[PDB]
Design a protein around this ligand. Structure first.
Ligand SMILES: *[C@@H]1O[C@H](CO)[C@@H](O[C@@H]2O[C@H](CO)[C@@H](O[C@@H]3O[C@H](CO)[C@@H](O)[C@H](O)[C@@H]3O)[C@H](O)[C@H]2NC(C)=O)[C@H](O)[C@H]1NC(C)=O
Ligand SMILES: *[C@@H]1O[C@H](CO)[C@@H](O[C@@H]2O[C@H](CO)[C@@H](O[C@@H]3O[C@H](CO)[C@@H](O)[C@H](O)[C@@H]3O)[C@H](O)[C@H]2NC(C)=O)[C@H](O)[C@H]1NC(C)=O
Ligand SMILES: *[C@@H]1O[C@H](CO)[C@@H](O[C@@H]2O[C@H](CO)[C@@H](O)[C@H](O)[C@H]2NC(C)=O)[C@H](O)[C@H]1NC(C)=O
Lengths: 122, 75, 493, 109, 75, 50
């Protein structure tokens, strides 16, 4: 079957970069999208950016260009997102989802993982 | 690219087929021909220009062919 | 008042017999009109909405070859057919391959082979035609009441919409009478051969004849969820390697290709239905019922103070914002112009008779002073006001600018350009007919020829006229050449 | 523009309640809308993988479409187990990003 | 493909500018210029052809300019 | 018959016939008796009858 492990939740301190790994096996990873939607506690979830594993670059939400970075590897079929700067704002669980490349399918987030959770405090 | 300067005639060819030969063979020619059939107005002016420029049928023919070929390809 | 210092607005003065004045309302610009005695008014066209569209020939600018199949046949055994050939969604061609004992065929030679594939469509770009039944223009007429919040205001005015069915329309004004419009939308822009093309969130207008000759797959546009695309071969491309097998690719998406293609088209912002901007329309102003509104009023005597300093526009027009002092009577502010050490009245007052309707709110009085030194008087008293202003332009410069504007208008509006300030007369009609014949000849002879080719042909024709002894031919061709240079330089705008 | 959908309440007897999604002329009026319902605290699942097509969601009772600038969802026979937050997400093509909504707190009595 | 044959001269005149007036005003000349800078070889051939076909000065210069325009565009 | 004295209105647009002729379909909302339809042609910037 096709699924995303999303590793395990970790929490850190402000001013340091944190990493969220996200592996999806069971299908040809090249053709489909990875969306990295954030979800805050008791708030709506907003999507930030795609990553095409085969040739894609970061296409963040306008709120988040220069705030996050996205990388990937084709051999292991895993997509990496890391937070270059942790303020007090980003206290939420970050997700993964498979997306299609269809114009009507840019929002097609069919499959989701568990959700790696990160919060920041002193 | 802007698809206005195809990577053609570079000389580094091999026995194997190119990316697209069956269509790039006649793409530009068909553009010129559909232009010409759509708009015949330029033909009268081209005929006049070739005719009143110093006329030896070699010169007239080459001027007419070039002038009728350049405007469509390079609009 | 609405048209102050915007889009090289001009002022067309004069009225014919029975007071009709012809005016063509270029969109993205506007005109103002003074009169012998009637109040001046400015008209601007805007929001030529087009509703109730029809969709035909939705194209396809992407593909997704999902299923692929193949078949081969030994040499001298006929063309190998494939069962997935007669369906309404498969595209393929036959190619020749060499087969031997190593490929399963006893006879050596060249054999037939096919490779057929289903062709899903993605991102259709629907094409919409507009019909004259539902077309609607909109022109806003504003009087020069001299309100405080009237200068350069796009909100003030009265809308007088016009449709190709009900051509005539009488615009009702607030205590000014009725203005008669006789505009004709069946001329000007012609939407019969213009097709609106909408893709993604953007729209365009492309000439109809050009909207079928651009090479892409096309469909009936019946939005029945299973479009059987005509000419699927054009998008999908087969590549055959050095002999041997045969494989199929998708050739990506034509988004930027189409965006590049529509270079010469205009823009039509469609949010609800369509709102075609960049329009063009000819109008007639039946100006009989325009009350001067100040016949009964009297020239008041109290003093006047101004709020902001004297300012001018691009043209010969200065905008003065005066305020009235402690007299309750709503009067008719007089006006005069004076020279340096002498007394001569020459400065035309461009607006109507300015009136201070209320004590508190100022009035915006704008007028045309003469070239050189100018002195302005704003009352009958000795201490009313004195506005000294120096205008920069010169008469010959003004004539040159007017000729430049007229030539620019002629370049875009073509044969109907004579109608812009046309007052009923034989000479304008004669020029109209002559220029219409010549314009038909010119546009027919130069159709689709681009600006660089126009300028090259023009300079070549000028040269061929500069080295000829046939004088009449020389002058005819040199005139055509100069006109060609001018049209080539002005085109694209 | 940006999409905003309202939170609302309902009851366990079967009734048609409409989760209306409102957008603009560039984000949802031309593109396929996508409907999500999330059981709270875990990963949201996808409810409608096209404009009016459901992959495997509760059939015959979850169906909706879109009209002009508005998209809507209709649920029938809603019981307590359907307690979820419902999300409408559309792809914005002007800003080149998908436009997720704030969220509906659909509580069923 | 469709990128070829824009309707630059289609003649549906308007007052406001078009979709891409700024680029499209010079893109074709830009293509010719970059083609010439890339490949200087064709200049010698064009000069030779004009010199050995052009009887007069004007005929020679017209032939040269037409040849130097058509080939980069037809590429 | 007498000539009409009320207004007219276009139910459907006009159209050519590739011969230089028009088909104008007009509905008469005026309640009055059957009346001959008045007609005149106004040339460009002229009152002439063509
Ligand atoms: C580019 O434009 C986007 C919006 O189109 C800008 O996003 C804005 O980012 C700031 C901070 O990243 C947001 O402020 C935040 O607002 C929330 C609202 O609840 C508040 O709780 C936070 O404390 C914070 O102040 C702002 O809302 C957001 N604007 C939006 C979402 O519309 C982005 O900053 C721009 N990039 C630039 C100018 O470089
Ligand atoms: C263009 O014309 C509009 C239409 O009048 C102008 O809007 C007007 O704005 C003024 C103030 O900005 C409004 O004045 C009102 O005054 C009363 C009493 O002092 C006060 O109670 C109101 O709150 C308001 O301030 C006026 O009502 C308003 N006209 C309306 C709403 O019809 C506009 O200022 C003009 N100029 C531009 C650049 O748009
Ligand atoms: C053409 O290609 C489609 C692409 O999916 C194929 O359909 C699959 O067929 C296999 C074989 O039975 C099934 O296991 C899959 O579930 C099918 N997928 C889908 C999406 O239907 C098939 O090879 C062809 N389909 C035809 C001819 O209808």
């Amino acid at each position: 079957q096709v699924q995303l492990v999303q590793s395990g939740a970790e929490v850190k301190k402000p001013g340091a970069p944190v990493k969220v790994s996200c592996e999806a096996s069971g299908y040809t990873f090249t053709d489909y999208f990875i969306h990295w939607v954030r979800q805050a506690p008791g708030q709506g979830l907003e999507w930030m950016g795609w990553i095409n594993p085969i040739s894609g670059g970061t296409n963040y939400h306008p709120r988040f260009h220069g705030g996050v970075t996205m990388t990937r590897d084709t051999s292991m079929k895993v997509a990496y997102m890391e937070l270059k700067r942790l303020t007090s704002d980003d206290t939420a669980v970050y997700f993964c989802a498979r997306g299609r490349d269809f114009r009507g399918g840019y929002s097609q987030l069919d499959y989701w993982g568990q959700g790696t959770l990160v919060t920041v405090s002193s | 690219s802007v698809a206005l300067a195809p990577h053609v005639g570079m000389g580094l060819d091999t026995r194997t087929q190119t990316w697209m030969s069956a269509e790039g063979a006649w793409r530009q020619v068909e553009k010129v021909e559909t232009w010409a059939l759509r708009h015949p107005g330029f033909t009268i002016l081209a005929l006049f220009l070739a005719h009143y420029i110093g006329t030896s049928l070699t010169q007239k023919v080459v001027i007419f062919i070039l002038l009728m070929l350049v405007t469509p390809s390079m609009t | 008042m609405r048209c102050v210092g915007v889009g090289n607005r001009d002022f067309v003065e004069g009225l014919s017999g029975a007071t009709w004045v012809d005016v063509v309302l270029e969109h993205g610009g506007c005109v103002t009109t003074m009169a012998k005695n009637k109040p001046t008014l400015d008209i601007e066209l805007q929001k030529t909405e087009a509703t109730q569209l029809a969709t035909l020939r939705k194209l396809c600018i992407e593909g997704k070859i999902t299923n692929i199949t193949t078949d081969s046949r030994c040499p001298t055994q006929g063309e190998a057919v494939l069962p997935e050939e007669q369906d309404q969604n498969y595209v393929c061609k036959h190619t020749y391959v060499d087969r031997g004992w190593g490929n399963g065929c006893g006879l050596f030679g060249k054999g037939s082979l096919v490779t057929c594939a289903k062709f899903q469509c993605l991102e259709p770009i629907e094409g919409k035609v507009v019909q004259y039944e539902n077309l609607k223009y909109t022109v806003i007429i504003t009087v020069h009441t001299g309100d405080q919040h009237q200068v350069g205001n796009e909100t003030q005015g009265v809308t007088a919409e016009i449709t190709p069915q009900a051509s005539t329309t009488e615009a009702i004004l607030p205590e000014y009478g009725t203005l008669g419009l006789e505009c004709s939308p069946r001329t000007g822009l012609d939407f019969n051969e213009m097709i609106l093309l909408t893709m993604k969130n953007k729209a365009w207008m492309v000439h109809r004849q050009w909207f079928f000759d651009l090479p892409l797959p096309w469909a009936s546009g019946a939005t029945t969820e299973t479009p059987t695309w005509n000419r699927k071969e054009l998008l999908v491309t087969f590549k055959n390697a050095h002999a041997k097998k045969q494989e199929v690719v998708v050739l990506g998406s034509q988004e930027g290709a189409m965006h590049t293609a529509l270079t010469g088209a205009t823009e039509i912002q469609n949010s609800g239905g369509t709102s075609i901007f960049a329009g063009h329309l000819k109008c007639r102003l039946k100006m009989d019922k325009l009350e001067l509104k100040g016949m009964s009023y009297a020239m008041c005597t109290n003093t006047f103070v101004l709020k902001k300093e004297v300012s001018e526009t691009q043209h010969g027009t200065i905008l003065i914002k005066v305020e009235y002092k402690g007299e309750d009577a709503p009067c008719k502010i007089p006006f005069s112009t004076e020279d340096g050490q002498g007394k001569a009245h020459n400065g035309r007052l461009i607006t109507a008779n300015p009136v201070v309707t209320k004590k508190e709110e100022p009035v915006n009085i704008e007028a045309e002073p003469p070239f050189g030194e100018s002195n302005i008087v704003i009352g009958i008293g000795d201490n009313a006001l004195k506005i000294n202003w120096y205008k920069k332009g010169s008469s010959i410069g003004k004539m040159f600018e007017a000729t430049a504007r007229g030539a620019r208008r002629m370049a875009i509006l073509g044969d109907t350009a004579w109608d812009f300030g046309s007052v009923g007369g034989v000479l304008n009609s004669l020029g109209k007919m002559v220029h219409q014949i010549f314009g038909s000849a010119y546009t027919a002879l130069f159709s689709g020829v681009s600006w660089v080719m126009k300028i090259g042909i023009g300079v070549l024709l000028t040269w061929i006229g500069l080295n000829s002894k046939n004088t009449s031919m020389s002058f005819s061709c040199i005139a055509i050449g100069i006109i060609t240079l001018y049209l080539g330089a002005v085109v694209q705008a | 523009s940006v999409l905003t959908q309202p939170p609302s309440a309902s009851g366990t007897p079967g009734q048609r309640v409409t989760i209306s999604c409102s957008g603009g002329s560039s984000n949802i009026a031309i593109n396929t809308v996508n409907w999500y319902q999330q059981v709270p605290g875990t990963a949201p699942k996808l409810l409608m993988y096209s404009n009016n097509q459901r992959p495997s969601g509760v059939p015959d009772r979850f169906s909706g479409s879109k009209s002009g600038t508005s998209a809507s969802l209709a649920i029938s026979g809603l019981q307590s187990e359907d307690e979820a937050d419902y999300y409408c997400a559309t792809w914005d093509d002007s800003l080149k990003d998908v436009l997720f909504g704030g969220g509906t707190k659909l509580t069923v009595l």
